[PDB]
């Protein structure tokens, strides 16, 4: 789908010649790993999520009510 094409490129991204060069006087190293940590925000923050969510069910928490909410506002 398109989620994992993206995920795909994203992955596929993630020389001092080659960071030497400078755009709008910036790193271009720098620029390009800025706009790919931008691209891949979404990616590692629904990671995170999945994370916090698996670390939770294994957790002793059993309050069905923070449970619910937890939920809703992941």
Do not use: D, P
Request: proline share 0%; aromatic share 18%.
């Amino acid at each position: 789908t398109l989620a994992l094409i993206e995920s795909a490129f994203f992955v596929v991204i993630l020389i001092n010649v080659l960071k030497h060069h400078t755009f709008w006087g910036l790193e271009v190293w720098k620029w390009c790993v800025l706009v790919m940590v931008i691209f891949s925000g979404m990616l590692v923050t629904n990671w995170f999520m999945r994370l916090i969510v698996f670390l939770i069910e294994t957790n002793f928490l059993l309050r069905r009510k923070v449970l619910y909410f937890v939920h809703g506002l992941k």
